[PDB]
Amino acid sequence: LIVTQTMKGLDIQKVAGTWYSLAMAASDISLLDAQSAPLRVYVEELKPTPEGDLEILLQKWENDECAQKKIIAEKTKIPAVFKIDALNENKVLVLDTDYKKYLLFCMENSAEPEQSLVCQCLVRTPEVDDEALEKFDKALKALPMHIRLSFN
Amino acid sequence: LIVTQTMKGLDIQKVAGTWYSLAMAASDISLLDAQSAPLRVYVEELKPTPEGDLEILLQKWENDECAQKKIIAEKTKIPAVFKIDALNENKVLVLDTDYKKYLLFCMENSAEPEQSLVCQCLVRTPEVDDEALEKFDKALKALPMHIRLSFN
């Protein structure tokens, strides 16, 4: 990705609160094949830390259960780009957000071969509104997504 | 679906030959979740029978293997609509085909609650041409597809 495709003037403190994963897209089928993929998560909550970092509350499908996992994304030199300092490092890219309604973000795997990428459209409330989905779609044409999910 | 969304003037004898599954879409995520779903098949070949019926050579993911399954779709009173006379009956709807390049078809589950539906874009040769994908996309806007796959 590029620094221009990311958001500009992002205020991490305004993304706080709960969010709902509405749609999912991925560059490689496998990445979201079954409930399988390690990138097949659902953002439940976003909590920024005073030092500017990003705490993310996810939920996964684990052993017929809905597992809660908490991972922290560290602030990098570039805004809207966060790093999940793990054995396998991941970068959380925030593309666009109005803070109030939607929030589009992606997770990129560097270690992998080409560009393992996965994005999510997050809505504040599960309203019968579809501006978020639209914004999502427009923001994904410029990317090679091979799988596309939309949730009930 | 409706008799107008199906093809008109379809010549089953011209669809003979081999085909490749290029893209997949489904009305319900589950239907194509992992290699899982019973509708997660890949058309390898289409062989029409003299009596007008349709023999389909599929391949599935079975026990870490690529299983070959042959099912026959019986000719119904309406053209481009075929029935897979099974315990669980299924209807194979052919939407549009130029016989030479692409072929768009869907599989609908009647027994299910609402409208279990799954469609495939089939190409003759895996060319670097994308008219088929386009035709596929246009033919799916008028349908509630929640999952969308595209193969390497």
Angle ∠(A93,B27,A92) on CA atoms, nearest 5 = 5
- The domain containing residue B82 runs over which residues? 1-152
Does B111 reach chain A within 8 Å, measured CB to CB?
no
User: Are residues A145 and A26 in contact, defined by beta-carbon separation less than 8 angstroms?
Assistant: yes
Question: SS3 letters for chain A?
Answer: CCCCCCCCCCCHHHCCEECEEEEEEECCHHHHCCCCCCCCCEEEEEEECCCCCEEEEEEEEECCEEEEEEEEEEECCCCCEEEECCCCCEEEEEEEECCCCEEEEEEEECCCCCCEEEEEEEECCCCCCCHHHHHHHHHHHCCCCCEEEECC
* Structural resolution in Å: 3.0
CATH number at residue A47: 2.40.128.20
Number of domains composing chain A = 1
CA distance A83 to A146: 24
Interface touch A149/B29, C-beta < 8 Å:
yes
Interface touch B147/A146, C-beta < 8 Å:
no
- Residue from the list A33, A35, A150 with its beta carbon closest to the beta carbon of B146: A150
Give the torsion through C-alpha atoms of A42, A48, A53, A56, to 10 deg.
-20
**What technique determined this structure?**
X-ray
Interface touch B35/A34, C-beta < 8 Å:
yes
